């Protein structure tokens, strides 16, 4: 089955331990990032091999250490399933080292480990992540060999730095981190070398693989190269009776829940079999007569009258429809379809069938025609013969890289609710005032989350909530780890960085105090 | 509108109601019975909590709380049911008409004042709260009291007091030979007399068409899902209410019954020890998770505390241009936010100002939404929604905010890499022509849920002992015949242009 091997290269030299007052130590940030990685890997029950190598350690535990080379590098953990032991090592009994080291030796050691341990089992993808401050001397004689080995092995590489490529600094606060002028000449050379290697390996896009600890703490980037792809749903988009185009639909957006589920266990003895649940059916009589399951029958309420409706009868009279249907009911102007009416709990991205030039070109033509005419397709969607049919809207979505249809369910007449709301614009009692409107305009201007950048004449997002990981999973993993490591201990408080990432940048907060005070004084609000 | 709805069906029993002006034409009594049955069936589904009554006047037999003469209250105000529908249908056919004539009577004098008094007493009998009290008169006589002026005056005054009380009277005039005229005698009896209905009507009332139109859809009174507090700052807080203008329709839950007698049964769930068998309190049990060889133990209170970040409400964040809100970033059905004003005074003014400024600047309020206590927060965008009304001043888009949930990073799934293949301009033009051929106008309520409609039809057929269910027309089907007729050969030339000669798009 699908598998992935990841080796984490951690810098440990004393240079990383240095920090400025009011700034979190880079070692702590790297520890937090790796803790999140291991927590997700272990608590997600995914078959991903995790190994840990630290460079800069005082001791030397490395197969290639022989020959007085690649010293001060320790292969703490080889390729194996993540375990609570690794988390305990990272959190508690791992300490900074007093000796510096070159990250190129760590790269060589990681490549050797990948090559030696990969032969055992099949590995779809191989990944390396390197956390370092790039504040140590390195030799440039290994560039060609490193590039050739990486290309031959075809293993993804990610770099994490204390800074990204003036209020208080907060972890993942959607604000500047490690203010400028704090980069040394050695750090400049390290940035240049990491940029060059990333460009050579990947290219321009590779330039985006140099993340920062604060950014990585609130971006989900660490799992970008390890996340899998959901299975595809194949069908045939049919306009009439003759024209048909083979298509595959993926779930572009779907609410993410917790796979693991709690189960009740007796407090005295923590065994599943101890607790048993039984259901009994009894009549509405004084004797509380009991009946068997086979005796029960199904019925429905009909306005104070109950009509029996057997399950077999329901199946016989059930609405039967051919399954796996994706047919175009018609085409309508995009204006008619409104975002307010979208229903369902998923969005489908529909591409052409895998490795099919004819279907691909047909779907491209359909998408281009819909975009040119500014139209959408009202279609009938059915996952299978056992799924209720749905009426949805498919609209084009064209990008410089890929083009595809986007399907979202639409409501029936029953679903719609007819609620009448009193008008507010004409309400004389609640009418606003010119001063109030000006104050509200000032408040809105002071709290804009988008900046109009004139250098590119575009809109830059300051608070892109779409990229923020769900805090619930992180909180659950943190609390589970704390309970496992400390059985007798109250649950820890929410991590500070989670709150920082769940809040807007300090700039808008500090730039909207006077407008908010003006709104408060102008608008009278009293509890009633 | 708070309370229930009460409706009384006044059906005339005069000989004019029992006659066929022409062959293959149901008599006025049969038409009234059909309308009553249709209304009962529609109320069973739309709102079963309403109250319906059936009263017959002009029959020899009498049955009223006042013990009046020539008035029979067939069914007092009560919730609709299948038994009432069957009783009404018992008189549906010609044999039913004969049975009604024999058991009830015919050709008896009456007084409009007496029937209005009976209806008022029936309304007073109900102990619930009636949002609307309505009476429907099914008569085809222009001048029930033409010989005696005193009776006509008594009826007029009784109708006047009934209208003053709050009872809404409607006249469902049926076809009569000479012609029905409201202006003659019923002009002052109807609570509202439309100027249009002043001539003589030679056909049935237009309201019968609406009454006979069955509706299969659960109609629900407006109800705020939750009243929360929008917090611009720590101190600046306004009270808002959240509604679900769009909500999925689910079939009524099944009910367990005893097969032998078909009566409701009580379901009980218990937990006992496999070794002791005694009842276990919630405190006794504990929540645990297994991760390989490691077990983690937590309690219910700890599990609830796990997912708890902030108190319920809408914590306002900065504003975002509407452009940055992608239309395809849909996660959950949207909600509607409207100022409450019943919790904090002055919130309506601030809400209106915010809506106006957001519309002027074309921005949306980004907020952290926490519906209930101990629930993870989500990110939502409140986009302004100005009031929109179609012709004849009927509102279609209420004013307020539309709340749309923005998906998190984990809610998005990566798509597999696909090589992009472009289409030549000729193919794009042919598809544009095909799409233009298949142009159609879409409305939000142009389709019906086939599953729910079929379930309702089957339930009605079973309840009413019908011969067979009424097959539901599937409006969701593509009606491919019309599409083939319209497209002509366009499909063929497109396929020959784009599809290779040997493609076989079937396997």
């Amino acid at each position: 089955g699908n598998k992935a091997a990841v080796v984490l290269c951690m810098d440990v030299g004393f240079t990383m331990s240095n920090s400025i007052p009011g700034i979190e130590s880079p070692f702590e940030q790297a520890k937090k990032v790796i803790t999140m990685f291991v927590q997700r890997q272990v608590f997600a029950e995914n078959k991903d091999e995790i190994a840990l190598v630290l460079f800069g350690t005082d001791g030397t535990d490395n197969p290639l250490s022989g020959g007085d080379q690649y010293q001060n590098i320790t292969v703490h953990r080889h390729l194996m399933l993540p375990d609570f032991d690794l988390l305990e090592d990272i959190e508690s009994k791992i300490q900074p080292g007093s000796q510096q080291a070159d990250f190129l030796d760590a790269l060589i050691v990681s490549m050797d480990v990948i090559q030696h341990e990969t032969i055992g089992k099949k590995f779809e993808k191989r990944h390396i992540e390197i956390f370092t401050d790039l504040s140590s001397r390195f030799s440039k004689s290994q560039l060609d060999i490193i590039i050739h080995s990486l290309k031959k092995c075809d293993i993804s590489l990610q770099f994490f730095l204390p800074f990204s490529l003036d209020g208080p600094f907060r972890l993942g606060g959607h604000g500047p981190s490690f203010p400028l002028k704090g980069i040394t000449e050695q750090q400049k050379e390290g940035l240049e070398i990491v940029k060059m290697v990333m460009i050579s390996l990947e290219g321009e896009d590779g330039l985006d693989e140099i993340y920062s600890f604060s950014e990585s703490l609130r971006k989900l980037c660490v799992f970008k190269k390890i996340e899998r792809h959901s299975i595809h749903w194949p069908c045939r988009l049919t306009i009439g009776s003759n024209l048909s185009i083979r298509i595959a639909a993926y779930k572009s957006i779907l609410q993410e829940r917790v796979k693991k589920t709690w189960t009740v266990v007796d407090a005295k003895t923590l065994k599943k079999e101890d607790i048993q649940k039984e259901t009994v059916y009894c009549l509405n009589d004084d004797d509380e007569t009991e009946v068997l399951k086979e005796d029960i029958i199904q019925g429905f309420r009909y306005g104070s009258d109950i009509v029996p409706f057997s399950k077999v009868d329901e199946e016989q009279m059930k609405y039967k429809s051919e399954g796996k249907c994706f047919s175009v009911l018609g085409f309508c102007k995009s204006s008619q379809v409104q975002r307010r009416f979208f229903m369902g709990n998923q969005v489908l991205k529909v591409f052409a069938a895998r490795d099919d030039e004819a279907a691909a070109v047909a779907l491209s033509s359909l998408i281009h025609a819909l975009d040119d005419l500014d139209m959408v397709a009202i279609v009938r969607y059915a996952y299978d013969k056992r799924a209720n049919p749905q009426v949805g809207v498919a609209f084009p979505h064209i990008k410089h890289n890929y083009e595809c249809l986007v399907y979202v369910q639409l409501p029936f007449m029953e679903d719609l609710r007819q609620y009448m709301f009193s008008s507010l614009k004409n309400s004389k009692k609640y009418a606003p005032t010119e001063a109030q409107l000006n104050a509200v305009d000032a408040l809105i201007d002071s709290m804009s989350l988008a900046k109009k950048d004139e250098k590119t004449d575009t809109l830059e997002d300051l608070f892109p909530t779409t990229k923020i990981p769900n805090p619930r999973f992180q909180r659950l993993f943190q609390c589970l780890l704390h309970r496992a490591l400390h059985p007798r201990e109250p649950l820890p408080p929410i991590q500070q960085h989670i709150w920082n990432m769940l809040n807007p940048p300090a700039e808008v907060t500090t730039k909207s105090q006077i407008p908010l005070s003006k709104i408060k004084t102008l608008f009278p609000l009293i509890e009633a | 509108y708070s309370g229930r709805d009460s409706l009384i069906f006044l059906v005339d029993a005069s000989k004019a109601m029992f006659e066929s002006q022409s062959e293959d034409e149901l008599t006025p009594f049969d038409m009234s019975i059909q309308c009553i049955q249709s209304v009962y069936i529609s109320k069973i589904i739309s709102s079963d909590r309403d109250l319906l009554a059936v009263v017959f006047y002009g029959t020899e037999k009498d049955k009223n709380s006042v013990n009046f003469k020539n008035i029979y209250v067939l069914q007092e105000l009560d919730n609709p049911g299948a038994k009432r529908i069957l009783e009404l249908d018992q008189f549906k056919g010609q044999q039913g008409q004969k049975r009604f004539q024999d058991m009830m009577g015919h050709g008896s004098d009456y007084s409009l004042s007496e029937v209005l008094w009976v209806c008022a007493n029936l309304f007073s009998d109900v102990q619930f709260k009636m949002s609307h009290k309505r009476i429907m008169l099914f008569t085809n006589e222009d001048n029930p009291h033409g010989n005696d002026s005193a009776k006509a005056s008594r009826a007029r005054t009784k109708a006047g007091d009934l209208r003053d009380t709050g009872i809404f009277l409607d006249l469902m005039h049926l076809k009569k030979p000479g012609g029905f005229d409201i202006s003659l005698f019923y002009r002052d009896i109807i609570s509202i007399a439309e100027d249009e209905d002043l001539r003589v009507h030679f056909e049935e009332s237009s309201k019968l068409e609406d009454l006979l139109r069955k509706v299969r859809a659960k109609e629900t009174r407006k109800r705020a899902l939750s009243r929360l507090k929008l917090k611009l700052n720590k101190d600046i807080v306004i009270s808002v209410g959240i509604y679900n203008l769009v909500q999925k329709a689910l079939k009524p839950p099944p009910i367990k019954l005893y097969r032998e007698t078909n009566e409701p049964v009580k379901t009980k769930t218990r937990t006992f020890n496999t070794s002791t068998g005694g009842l276990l309190l919630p405190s006794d049990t504990k929540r645990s998770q297994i991760y390989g060889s490691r077990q983690i133990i937590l309690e219910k209170e700890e599990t609830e505390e796990l997912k708890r970040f902030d108190d319920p409400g809408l914590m306002l964040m900065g504003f975002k241009p509407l452009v940055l809100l992608k239309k395809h970033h849909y996660l959950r059905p949207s909600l509607f936010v409207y100022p409450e004003e019943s919790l904090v005074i002055g919130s309506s003014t601030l809400f209106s100002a915010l809506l106006i400024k957001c519309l002027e600047k074309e921005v949306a309020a980004l907020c952290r939404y926490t519906p209930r206590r101990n629930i993870p927060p989500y990110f939502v965008a409140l986009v302004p929604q100005e009031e929109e009304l179609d012709d004849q001043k009927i509102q279609v888009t209420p004013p307020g905010f539309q709340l749309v949930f923005l998906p998190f990073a984990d809610d998005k799934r990566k798509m597999p890499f696909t090589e992009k293949i472009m289409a030549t301009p000729e193919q794009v033009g042919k598809m544009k022509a095909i799409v233009e051929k298949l142009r159609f106008t879409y409305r939000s309520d142009s389709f019906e849920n086939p599953v729910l409609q079929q379930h309702f039809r089957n339930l009605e057929a079973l309840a009413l002992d019908l011969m067979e269910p009424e097959q539901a027309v599937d409006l969701t089907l593509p009606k491919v015949e019309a599409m083939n007729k319209r497209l002509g050969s366009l499909v063929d030339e497109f396929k020959e242009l784009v599809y290779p000669p040997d493609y076989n798009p079937e396997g």
Partner: peptide, 23 residues
């Protein structure tokens, strides 16, 4: 007031479902 349903007062009489009607 206009368009009110005689069965459920307070709710406008919804138009019958039409489906797809090509122009």
């Amino acid at each position: 007031c206009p368009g009110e349903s005689l069965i459920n007062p307070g709710f406008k009489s919804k138009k019958p479902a039409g489906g797809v009607d090509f122009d």
